[PDB]
């Protein structure tokens, strides 16, 4: 977070924990909204043989 070192120290002391380590606000660890095109897999019955529905 964009806070002065003094403010950070006061905040951590008042909380009693190092808040800068785990800040609730999300900055850059977020995943990119634009992602590579996925290729989802097929199921166990996506076969051209021994796939008779009577057996499943």
């Amino acid at each position: 977070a964009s806070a002065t070192r003094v403010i950070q120290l006061l905040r951590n002391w008042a909380s009693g924990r190092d808040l800068q380590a785990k800040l609730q606000l999300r900055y850059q660890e977020i995943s990119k909204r634009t992602q590579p095109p996925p290729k989802l897999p097929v199921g166990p019955s996506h076969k051209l043989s021994n796939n008779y529905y009577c057996t499943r």
Partner: protein, 429 residues
């Protein structure tokens, strides 16, 4: 007898098979045909059927069903409908070119067979459905029939025996499906050549809705010789349940492609080498052989090395005698392409009536073309096997089964070639 295939010229039913003599009545009678036919007819229908059973004659059209029993099916008291007999002369099975030889070179033998069979089954008349392409053979057959009519061999008081029998010839119009017995019946009746669904069996309801029996040209033509020479004579040749002499239309990659009458249960390699001069390039150059026309599955060279050309032995070899049209394929043959061509033949000769045949055969043809190009995946081979199994046994006629069998044989014996071709195609792209 343990070693078969030593048939002598004194034991060959078709003596003018090569057309080197007079096909007309004079030559036929000089060769022993049309001999004491009156006594044969007066002997009794039961006697004739018993002689056929003693000979152990089985269906020479490909089914292999015992001919004596099949003909005995129609030896019943008349139901009021005029009984008829049909002689299957379509010969549409690829590789099968025997019936043509019989009709064109010994037509009077076939006519005498028709008379004897009709007497044995109490048939009013016989309709020989010949293939339309066999126009000259049909002309020869008609000339023979005219000669028989004028000589009194057939017609009213046939051979002076009192039996009133007629022989009709109906030309086809280019349909392999017409080879099927019920499809043949429908074609004669004037409808599209689409096979019926048994029951009713043809013996009960057949041509013109009358008791009818369909028999192969060879099957009918051997009946008078079987009667005259005795059933024991016919039985002596061939193993038990595989007795007689079968015409072998050796064709393909052989040095001397020809049709030869040889004893049943003859070793395949012997038959190929004895008459056709062996496989082109030698025995080792052979790839595979289709023993019976095209419907029967192929047998690889390993099995071809030691196998008897009879019904039972070939059944053990995952194939059948069928029409005994040996199609020899050398190792310069793309087996995939050949089987695909056969599948295409079936596709272009399917009636289209039954859904499995109509759609599955075309689907298999597409997949086979893709296999020939290698444009596929290895699992598609198992998929094709499943498709063939689905078609087989689920169709009105046996055309679907006889089209599934080649694919099954190709997979079962040369799957490595298919997989390797697919690999090669993948590497190219």
């Amino acid at each position: 007898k343990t070693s078969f295939g030593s048939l002598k010229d004194e034991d060959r039913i078709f003596t003018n098979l090569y057309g080197r003599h007079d096909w007309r009545l004079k030559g036929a009678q000089s060769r022993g045909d049309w001999y004491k036919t009156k006594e044969i007819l007066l002997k009794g229908p039961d006697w004739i059927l018993g002689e056929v059973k003693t000979s152990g004659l089985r269906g020479r059209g490909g089914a292999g069903f015992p001919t004596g029993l099949k003909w005995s099916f129609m030896n019943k008291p008349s139901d009021g409908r005029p009984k008829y007999l049909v002689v299957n002369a379509d010969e549409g099975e690829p590789g099968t070119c025997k019936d043509r030889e019989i009709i064109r070179h010994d037509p009077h033998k076939l006519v005498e067979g028709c008379l004897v069979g009709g007497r044995a089954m109490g048939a009013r008349a016989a309709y020989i459905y010949i293939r339309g392409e066999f126009y000259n053979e049909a002309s020869n057959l008609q000339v023979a029939i005219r000669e028989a009519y004028e000589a009194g061999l057939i017609g009213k008081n046939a051979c002076g025996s009192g039996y009133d029998f007629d022989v009709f010839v109906v030309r086809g119009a280019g349909a392999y499906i017409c080879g099927e017995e019920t499809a043949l019946i429908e074609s004669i009746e004037g409808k599209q050549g689409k096979p019926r669904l048994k029951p009713p069996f043809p013996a009960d309801v057949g041509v013109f809705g009358c008791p009818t029996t369909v028999a192969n040209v060879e099957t009918v033509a051997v009946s008078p010789t079987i009667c005259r020479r005795g059933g024991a004579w016919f039985a002596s040749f061939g193993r038990e349940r595989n007795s007689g002499t079968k015409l072998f239309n050796i064709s393909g990659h052989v040095n001397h492609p020809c049709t030869v009458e040889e004893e049943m249960s003859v070793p395949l390699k012997e038959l190929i080498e004895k008459h056709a001069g062996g496989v082109i390039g030698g025995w080792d150059n052979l790839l595979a052989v289709i023993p019976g026309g095209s419907s029967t599955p192929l047998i690889p060279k390993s099995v071809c090395e030691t196998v008897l050309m009879d019904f039972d032995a070939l059944v053990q070899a995952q194939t059948g005698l069928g029409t005994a049209a040996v199609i020899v394929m050398d190792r310069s043959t793309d087996i995939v392409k050949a089987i695909a061509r056969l599948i295409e033949f079936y596709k272009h000769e399917s009636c289209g009536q039954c859904t499995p045949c109509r759609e599955g055969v075309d689907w298999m043809n597409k997949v086979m073309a893709r296999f020939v190009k290698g444009d596929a995946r290895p699992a598609e081979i198992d998929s094709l096997w499943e498709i063939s199994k689905q078609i087989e046994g689920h169709t009105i006629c046996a055309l679907g089964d006889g089209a599934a069998w080649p694919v099954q044989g190709l997979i079962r014996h040369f799957r490595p070639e298919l997989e390797e071709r697919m690999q090669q195609f993948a590497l190219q792209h």
